[PDB]
Design an enzyme around this catalytic site. Structure first.
Site, mmCIF file in Angstrom:
data_model
loop_
_atom_site.group_PDB
_atom_site.id
_atom_site.type_symbol
_atom_site.label_atom_id
_atom_site.label_comp_id
_atom_site.label_asym_id
_atom_site.label_seq_id
_atom_site.Cartn_x
_atom_site.Cartn_y
_atom_site.Cartn_z
ATOM 1 N N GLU A 1 28.357 -20.145 -28.009
ATOM 2 C CA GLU A 1 28.816 -19.036 -28.838
ATOM 3 C C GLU A 1 28.652 -19.492 -30.223
ATOM 4 O O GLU A 1 29.483 -20.147 -30.679
ATOM 5 C CB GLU A 1 30.519 -18.852 -28.375
ATOM 6 C CG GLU A 1 30.934 -17.874 -29.579
ATOM 7 C CD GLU A 1 32.275 -18.124 -29.893
ATOM 8 O OE1 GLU A 1 32.688 -19.469 -29.925
ATOM 9 O OE2 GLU A 1 33.227 -17.351 -30.268
ATOM 10 N N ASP B 1 32.010 -23.043 -26.375
ATOM 11 C CA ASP B 1 32.672 -22.614 -27.377
ATOM 12 C C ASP B 1 32.516 -23.192 -28.931
ATOM 13 O O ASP B 1 32.291 -24.366 -29.061
ATOM 14 C CB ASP B 1 34.368 -22.778 -27.092
ATOM 15 C CG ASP B 1 35.381 -22.365 -28.073
ATOM 16 O OD1 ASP B 1 35.416 -21.048 -27.908
ATOM 17 O OD2 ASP B 1 36.009 -23.016 -28.732
#
Ligand SMILES: OC[C@H]1O[C@H](O[C@H]2[C@H](O)[C@@H](O)[C@@H](O[C@H]3[C@H](O)[C@@H](O)[C@@H](O[C@H]4[C@H](O)[C@@H](O)[C@@H](O[C@H]5[C@H](O)[C@@H](O)[C@@H](O)O[C@@H]5CO)O[C@@H]4CO)O[C@@H]3CO)O[C@@H]2CO)[C@H](O)[C@@H](O)[C@@H]1O
Ligand SMILES: OC[C@H]1O[C@H](O[C@H]2[C@H](O)[C@@H](O)[C@@H](O[C@H]3[C@H](O)[C@@H](O)[C@@H](O)O[C@@H]3CO)O[C@@H]2CO)[C@H](O)[C@@H](O)[C@@H]1O
Ligand SMILES: OC[C@H]1O[C@H](O)[C@H](O)[C@@H](O)[C@@H]1O
Ligand SMILES: OC[C@H]1O[C@H](O)[C@H](O)[C@@H](O)[C@@H]1O
Ligand SMILES: [Ca+2]
Ligand SMILES: [Ca+2]
Ligand SMILES: [Ca+2]
Ligand code: NA
Length: 481
Positions: free
Chosen positions: A262, A232
């Site tokens: 990400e 993340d």
């Protein structure tokens, strides 16, 4: 060969704590559909029970401790989760656990901390003098005690926060003052320095923090028996840290953990930098492709389809690209809303699923629908595309992205897969046809549309060419079934 990843969640899933069970009983179904890996939602305790998980409170509480007013997470208890993993493992499906290391939200209490305000549009510029604020930086985990880990978080473990509890001022970013306190580097450069994002920003310069997060990565991997990670917000995290973190975990567990980060920026340059800086030791989601897909679904036929792959990661660095159509951030109402329209969605899934480059992903939201916002389940249209990938998408590829509306590409197939080979043709506008080469050994074969959008057949001529057709704003995948 030809694996397919699936993000098993959407932002508006109901807070009924029965998600791990849904995943548990859907394992057999998914594996038969061509899914080979599931990326599960945050498995740990968030700032509250209905938190999607990104408001990461305690990474060692996987729905096992009474904290934040609940024992289970939004998705369930720790035992249900592990029963889910077992089910996926038994059906030969790998498990990718999400990873939130950029921040910690839902602190147990506040602390008086010296800090300065910085310019939100340039965190490198201090806009005030030093002064005392009240920040949510203290974590003691009352419901867990020292079980699994005895590490406690305090203000000095973070670089800053965006909320001063003693004044409650809006639109402020606070950089903590102290020994060696500074935003981390390297991180994305938008806003000067993008280390700070939300909640209490973890300081990757502090050795105790690095040591702890590495230790947690291993505990998390062995506890669940994870096969990989979905990391993340890596653009807000020190690049070298993430690289060495992944390396640490692969080494301490003897497993070559898959990892997809990400890096949410619609810029290939920025993404390439991240890849080079992280020594190419893991993949990234193709955020630019997602926007190309989104922009195309929003152009009403005027998108030049020959460019659908321009500026994308899968086009420049295919080995490190995890291609997706939509996710929890791009779905309706979310912060980064940019939802690929329904009519174009199947074209988008053919673009990622039937081509040989990139590691494709299926979004739970598109597959099962998002009832809270009116998104119907599109599995009936995605399944045919999944079967094409599982059985037909093999061998040499021949592209035909040579028309502003109607583009296509074929796969010649290989002996490793019986009857493999396909011809994908799509149009974001008016229908039509296109001659394409599928291989001379295919001469005489009678092909049909696995999506069923076109009911006829296409006979490969003596030279290996077939004249495939497609309806307007549609996709057809002809195979030798
Ligand atoms: O309600 C009383 C509460 O008080 C204490 O909580 C405090 C927090 O511990 C403290 O960190 C602070 O929380 C703030 C946070 O700092 C601030 O950033 C903001 O959080 C927003 C994000 O800004 C926003 O971007 C969004 O983030 C999503 C994102 O959209 C999505 O794409 C994905 O990435 O997930 C992210 C996480 O959900 O949403 C979050 C949350 O709306 O606001 C926070 C406050 O709401 O201040 C809190 C006190 O107000 C105690 O710790 C707690 O126990 C008590 O319940
Ligand atoms: O899903 C099961 C499978 O997942 C992992 O393999 C993936 C790779 O990690 C990923 O890089 C990607 O690799 C493909 C390239 O993206 C593509 O451009 C082309 O070069 O083909 C590559 C694969 O042949 O996708 C694969 C999944 O197909 C993991 O490493 C495996 O161990 C696991 O079995
Ligand atoms: O406040 C007590 C101590 O807290 C933290 O360890 C700081 O890094 C240190 O500089 C300070 O002296
Ligand atoms: O492993 C390193 C290499 O990985 C990939 O092939 C990249 O495309 C290439 O640019 C890089 O040099
Ligand atoms: Ca720092
Ligand atoms: Ca950060
Ligand atoms: Ca067009
Ligand atoms: Na930081």
């Amino acid at each position: 060969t030809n694996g397919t990843m699936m993000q098993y969640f959407e932002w508006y899933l109901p807070n009924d704590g029965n998600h791990w069970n849904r995943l548990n009983s859907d394992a057999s179904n998914l594996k038969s559909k061509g899914i080979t890996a599931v990326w599960i939602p945050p498995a740990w305790k968030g700032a509250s029970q209905n938190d999607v998980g990104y408001g990461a409170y305690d990474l060692y509480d996987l729905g096992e401790f009474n904290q934040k007013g609940t024992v289970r997470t939004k998705y369930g208890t720790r035992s249900q989760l592990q029963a889910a993993v077992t089910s996926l493992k038994n059906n030969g499906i790998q498990v990718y656990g999400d990873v939130v290391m950029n921040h910690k939200g839902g602190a147990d209490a506040t602390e008086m901390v010296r800090a300065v305000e910085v310019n939100p549009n340039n965190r490198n510029q201090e806009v005030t003098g030093e002064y005392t604020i009240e920040a949510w930086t203290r974590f003691d985990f009352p419901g867990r005690g020292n079980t699994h880990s005895s590490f406690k978080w305090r203000w000095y473990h973070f670089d800053g926060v965006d909320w001063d509890q003693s004044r409650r001022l809006n639109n402020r970013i606070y950089k903590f003052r102290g020994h060696g306190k500074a935003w981390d580097w390297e991180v994305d450069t938008e806003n000067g320095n993008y280390d700070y994002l939300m909640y209490a920003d973890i300081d990757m310069d502090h050795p105790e923090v690095v040591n702890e997060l590495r230790n947690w990565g291993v505990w998390y991997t062995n506890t669940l028996g994870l096969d990989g990670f979905r990391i993340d917000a890596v653009k807000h995290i020190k690049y070298s840290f993430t690289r060495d973190w992944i390396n640490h975990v692969r080494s301490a567990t003897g497993k070559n953990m898959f990892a997809v980060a990400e890096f949410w920026k619609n810029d290939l340059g920025a993404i390439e930098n991240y890849l080079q800086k992280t020594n190419w030791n893991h993949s990234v989601f193709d955020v630019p492709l997602h926007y190309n897909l989104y922009n195309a679904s929003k152009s009403g036929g005027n998108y030049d389809m020959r460019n659908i792959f321009n500026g994308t990661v899968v086009q420049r660095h295919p080995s490190h690209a995890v291609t997706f159509v939509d996710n929890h951030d791009s779905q309706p109402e979310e912060a980064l809303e940019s939802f690929v329209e329904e009519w174009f969605k199947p074209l988008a899934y053919a673009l990622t699923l039937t081509r040989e480059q990139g590691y494709p992903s299926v979004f739970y939201g598109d597959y099962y629908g998002i009832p809270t916002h009116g998104v119907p389940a599109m599995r009936s249209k995605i399944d045919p595309i999944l079967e094409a990938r599982q059985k037909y998408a093999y061998g040499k590829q021949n592209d035909y992205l040579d028309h502003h509306n109607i583009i296509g590409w074929t796969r010649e197939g290989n002996t490793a897969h019986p009857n493999s080979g396909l011809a994908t043709i799509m149009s974001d506008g008016a229908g039509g046809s296109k001659w394409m080469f599928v291989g001379r050994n295919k001469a005489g074969q009678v092909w049909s549309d696995i999506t069923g959008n076109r009911t006829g057949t296409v006979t490969i001529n003596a030279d290996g060419w077939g004249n495939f057709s497609v309806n307007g704003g549609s996709v057809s995948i002809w195979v030798n079934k």
